[PDB]
Amino acid sequence: TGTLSDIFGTPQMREIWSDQNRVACYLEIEAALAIVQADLGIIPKNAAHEIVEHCRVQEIDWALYKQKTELIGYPVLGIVQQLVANCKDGLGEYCHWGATTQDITDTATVMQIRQSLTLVKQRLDSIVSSLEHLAEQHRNVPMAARSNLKQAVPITFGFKMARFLATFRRHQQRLVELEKRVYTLEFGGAAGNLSSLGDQGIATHDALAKMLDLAPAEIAWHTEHDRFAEVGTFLGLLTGTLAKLATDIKLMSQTEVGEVGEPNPISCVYIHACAANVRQGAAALLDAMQSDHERGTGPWEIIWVQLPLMMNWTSAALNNADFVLRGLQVFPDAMQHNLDLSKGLIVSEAVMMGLGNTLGRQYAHDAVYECCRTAFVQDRPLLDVLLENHEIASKLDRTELEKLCDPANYLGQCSQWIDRVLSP
Amino acid sequence: TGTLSDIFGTPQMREIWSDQNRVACYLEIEAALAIVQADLGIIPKNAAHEIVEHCRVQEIDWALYKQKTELIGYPVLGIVQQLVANCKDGLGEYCHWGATTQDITDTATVMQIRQSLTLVKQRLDSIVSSLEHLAEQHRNVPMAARSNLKQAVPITFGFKMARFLATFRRHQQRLVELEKRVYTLEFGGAAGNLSSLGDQGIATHDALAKMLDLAPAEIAWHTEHDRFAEVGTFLGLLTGTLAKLATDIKLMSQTEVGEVGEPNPISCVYIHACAANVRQGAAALLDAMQSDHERGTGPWEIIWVQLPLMMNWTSAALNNADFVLRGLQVFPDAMQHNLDLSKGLIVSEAVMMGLGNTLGRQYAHDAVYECCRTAFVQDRPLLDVLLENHEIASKLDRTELEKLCDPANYLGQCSQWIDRVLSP
Amino acid sequence: TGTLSDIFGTPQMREIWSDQNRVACYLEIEAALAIVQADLGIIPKNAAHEIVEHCRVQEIDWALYKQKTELIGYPVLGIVQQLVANCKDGLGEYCHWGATTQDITDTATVMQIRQSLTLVKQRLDSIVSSLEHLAEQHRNVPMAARSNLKQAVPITFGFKMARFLATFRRHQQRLVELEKRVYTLEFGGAAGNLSSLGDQGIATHDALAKMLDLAPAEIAWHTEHDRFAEVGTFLGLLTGTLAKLATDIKLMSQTEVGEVGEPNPISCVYIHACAANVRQGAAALLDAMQSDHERGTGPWEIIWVQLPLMMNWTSAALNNADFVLRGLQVFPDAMQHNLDLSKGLIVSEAVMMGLGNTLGRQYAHDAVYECCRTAFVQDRPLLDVLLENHEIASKLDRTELEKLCDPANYLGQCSQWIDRVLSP
Amino acid sequence: TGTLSDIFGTPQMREIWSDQNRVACYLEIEAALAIVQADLGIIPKNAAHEIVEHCRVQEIDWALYKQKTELIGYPVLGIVQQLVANCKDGLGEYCHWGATTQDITDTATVMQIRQSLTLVKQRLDSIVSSLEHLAEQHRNVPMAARSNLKQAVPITFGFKMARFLATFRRHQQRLVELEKRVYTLEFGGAAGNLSSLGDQGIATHDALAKMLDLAPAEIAWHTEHDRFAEVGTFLGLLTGTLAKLATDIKLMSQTEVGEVGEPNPISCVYIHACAANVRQGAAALLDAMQSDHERGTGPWEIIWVQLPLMMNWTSAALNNADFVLRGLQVFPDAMQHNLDLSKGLIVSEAVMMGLGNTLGRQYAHDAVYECCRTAFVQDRPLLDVLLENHEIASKLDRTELEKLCDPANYLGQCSQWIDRVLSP
């Protein structure tokens, strides 16, 4: 394949959305339709048997199919033409009975989405497993939290990972919830009412849905693209979180920080570009919801292009995030070094709390604040400046004071918050 | 307030996102926080009573708050400063205890979203009610379905409305599902671990959630923006369907079509522009999910701008669609006139089927197909061309053939599909 | 190659952005670099001769290049490695001298853009030629102008085409203007300062620019992506106009309108989807301008994905519009029929003016206004309602009033406006 | 005003796009139209004098105007109504003569864009001036360049600033080029052909353009939105560069880097959010180019909302970037400290070059590479490891060797590249 096809895509996701799997879905739908309609007495029983026997992607002439599609303008009837020609005894004229091409394309797209989300669920399960392990392994490793890219107060690396873990669990819930809407048959014919099937239209629809393990539709949805668009916005939300992970890991991999390492942050690079492309594709799928009347004049076709791209981009981002988290290098010594840069300023709030009991909470804040900025101007440890304050030094000895100035003693309830995420 | 403020926004939704309601939310949070911490014994109970007494938006100096916000850079501490100054006996120094400003903004944004979605749910119930009425009222009103802006086969106007109705019901389900994730407290302090509250952080968080009728958070989510972004993508999905409705109504009110009328399609005009703005805002909120570390350096602030805009645009789109659907003018005579334009071509498939027993399946298809092409090129009724087929004219009188060429006799199961959207 | 590859892309544009042309550009750059540095005395002249001799894309092992690119992470050094191995006597070790991989990718992307814009300019010249012919051919063909999808006043079809023509001429000017910025060499090395070339960096850069027929760069632009992004926004602007053309043509070919025909509006369908995808890609390229420091950690790679996609989508949109405009079917009789739909209401303003001298300015307005409303509600010709105004019928015979109610007599200066777009 | 109105907007840009300035533009256009048409003999000379005297924004009833606009649906005729009522002797009936409301809104928008770009040009001039000073002041200050957020080789801070300077100069060229297209009159009447003005339509148009200091239009452009959309894409490109500047400054302001300081990087925070909102707004303006027929049914109205927002967001981003660059704090000692982190590895390429003359260039690379990774594993200076190599140590003494290991001696032609940018 192409040089970059497996860098911004993956083999597995490329296969699902390939021409071969797409047509294979078409053929399974035509097969299930023939079987259903024979059982209902709509078409003769030979014909179903002969049609099903020729619903094999290996018999397709791809070059002719491309020609016919460019020249019909839509991608299904070129396959129906070869199916009729490969059946004997004129029995092929009973295939595609009452269908329109968008019944086949919509339902095939549903089938490909289900295959795609199987891969996504597996990657998510693996990512969640890695984050559960990392939150526990590094539960007590202290590090500087950062607000506006400036050090704030200490936290633990496990706490950081538990926050990603909780987010991906919410994405897992979103996925399961949309599946019950998305895994739905589309079978409505030219205008949605299956007019050519008369009083057998709904009966055919419901039987076909059961054959394909899909929910029956309430009504036709050929220009009602909320199911596909919702898949796209979910991909946007998920890669949004993947892009945050890539951002934080690449920030922690700067030469001047050195707190983690990928197993150059190339995986983070690919995640970032993939997420950027997916979010704009989501806007395009929202745009496509403007499909006019009973078959959209353009909007529908946006989905043909964007959905396979977005799925491929997302699988590549998921692949890279899974790989990084599963072999992530963590460097507690660099984390400790960065905690010590401010020479105590990062835990001034811990000094205020300890001294608040003897001097008053508000007064302790103001007193320690003055010591902080004094320590900043002179580039000296806060401990040295605190000890030069009789009001402070008369109420806390050195042993207590370097304890309060030790960044590793101001972790708050990080461990209990981690337990709250791990327990469910 | 402004010339266009109630055209691309609404009074109710503008009030929700105004500075006054935003700060009013801030004060309710600070009040509830003081009460909770007084109950836990963290601050004196008389201090809480004085703080709560001064948690009134009418006491705020707006110009001073504006100035301080521009100097500080963030919108909460200007309000905490006035609360501290307005309380007696220095008791205001116990407010905002252990909080960071993004605890207040995130939780206030949650409360404003709940208020917004109450309005959205009301609009949705009303739109759904109108469409149920329209689907039943016009259940049997025939019209031409349109594919690629060309007439396809006949349907009924009620069928068309039932297809919108089924979609809005899916949007209602999406709304309910995201509410359980979105209606969640944010109280985590500077780095998420509430370090300044020691062993009282989790207790304070959970009690505050109950006081505000919000779910307790698993863990802090200051840079985990999936709850806000998912609100944005839902607004994108909903306004996508609103934009289709606007498209189909303005197409049906073209001078050359005239099948419906607004109660110039000016409401459809506003809906179109609102949806376009909302879909791009959703991409920006997905972009904002890239918030670094424990407080984002820029991405977070995207949400401050986009969320009130998208809420306002969405409420204006909903208002116009609600208004249009409640007084929609329907013109069945124009509908019938347009059905008669093709002079039978629109039901050629019904003619093929009706003739299959008399002519043979193959000839019926081929004869009607060729006769259709003649009638189109010559601009004559299909019936007249069929009668000039001696084989056809020898077996079917004009009366029987006239029934097959009548578009009102080829509606399929439109009524039963309507029942499927309504009756369950 | 793929079923849809020539429907949402084109053979010529796919070739330009293929791996083979991309690498072929790489080799031409390495060849020109060796020659320049041999001329400057940096590398031996026999080494350059051997490098140039092996700068042939036919000698590349594509599967190995694919593997190495996936291991290295970037797409150039896999080609430099095979060039070094294919040269004799270790003379290949003088290639890529002082270059970084983004020098090769940026400059190759520039060359591929120049090839792409050659195709774009050809399509633009052909579209402009077709519109000049259509504006002149149909200069006097009357039709209804439409505002908010409602008939407004009469215009001519040539006037409508002259308005598209004027727009594409503005797009041609934008194209020419950006070419002088975009056709620029990138050769700056790892950090932009060509440190490894010492006092020969600028000399090498400027000589290489001449060898490739590119402008010398002011300074390195590895993270300064305005040249590539401006190509993307231009494609957005151009496909925006193409999307309007597709909209107006598919509206005029509605069954109820029938004023034009494609030579189903299938080309308009593809144009619509291509433009929607291109406009979102432009936002992604603007996003990519956020490239950090001297080599971007993610944003840069957005360009690798989006630019070939947008180029391909744009070429397919241009191909379809070029094809449609060159064989557009125009139906003046349908145009006249639609002009006659309102039975005179569309030229009520001409009636007011014609009557002003006879009735007085004020009464002419008021009388014609009220008569219009009667004719609309009663679905009768305006002329008949005017004649039932005794004051009007006493001063103007039917013949004079019939001329004022004739839409073909109220065309204004359509022809002179056409001359303004054509004659200059 | 609102709490955040001057944080994500500016006073000056809010004024330009306010209701008051918008209507003031409307009134000037109606005044110029009256004067022009009196000179042409189209309307009587009193009337022009009386109309002009009442073209004053102070006489407008804003509450009535809001009511009429919501209820007409478009924003001009409410102003024409008050103008007619404020003129004596029925002379107001000659205003707005032959105009449609979009002539007034389009032309007013052009006038507001010209006012807006005056502010943008001033900010750009000030930013370019700051960057010229910084490139010269810090021409020789060494620092680490960074690729993929990892240290690459040394450059100077002045070199970094010269790269921004060259980019903003290209943005200045883009601005000047679009001005000649954008500063154009829109005066075409209901359908673009000014039918109600007969053979005086073009004459009125050209005279009005001269009166307003605007270019005459080739033809009407009511649904041809490339001029407005092009303003939006330029804003996207410019804020793209502003967002890169904010990114690099906030990265250099991390606690662990400390190389620059703003005069928390709050200005960088606002720039980032503003740029993110502008890029999506650009996609919406591209979307709006799909305006149907002679007056768009929705797309046109997108521009009413997005353009003032994008202008305001851009002015706030420009304001912050201007302020930061004009008082930027630069810390060469921190820059030198970060250059020394790798203990010589960052200038290993300088050692390869110096040693290449005695050992051969290729062999020198391989030899120094081995010393580099040895130095990395043992966390020792490259100099110490190099001196432990007889082949290397026999050809370069220590004095030469710590010179080559000194990061401040490997700047390449940074100074000459700066001169190349400053010289024009």
Curated annotation (Swiss-Prot), chains A, B, C, D:
InterPro entries attached to this UniProt entry: AdenyloSucc_lyase_C, Fumarate_lyase_fam, Fumarate_lyase_N, L-Aspartase-like
GO terms for cellular component: cytosol; nucleus
Signal peptide residue numbers: none
GO MF annotation list: lyase activity
Protein location: Cytoplasm, Cytosol; Nucleus
EC annotation from Swiss-Prot or TrEMBL: 4.1.1.113
Keywords, ordered alphabetically: Cytoplasm, Lyase, Nucleus
Entries under SMART domains matching the protein: ADSL_C
Chain ranges passing through the membrane: none
Enzyme class: lyase
Pathway note: Secondary metabolite biosynthesis
Disruption phenotype: Abolishes the production of itaconic acid.
Reactions accelerated catalytically: trans-aconitate + H(+) = itaconate + CO2
Function: Trans-aconitate decarboxylase; part of the gene cluster that mediates the biosynthesis of itaconic acid and 2-hydroxyparaconate. Cis-aconitate is secreted by the mitochondrial tricarboxylate transporter MTT1. In the cytosol cis-aconitate is converted into trans-aconitate via isomerization by the aconitate-delta-isomerase ADI1. Decarboxylation of trans-aconitate by the trans-aconitate decarboxylase TAD1 then leads then to the production of itaconic acid.
Family: Belongs to the class-II fumarase/aspartase family.
Name recorded for this polypeptide: Trans-aconitate decarboxylase 1
Organism: Mycosarcoma maydis
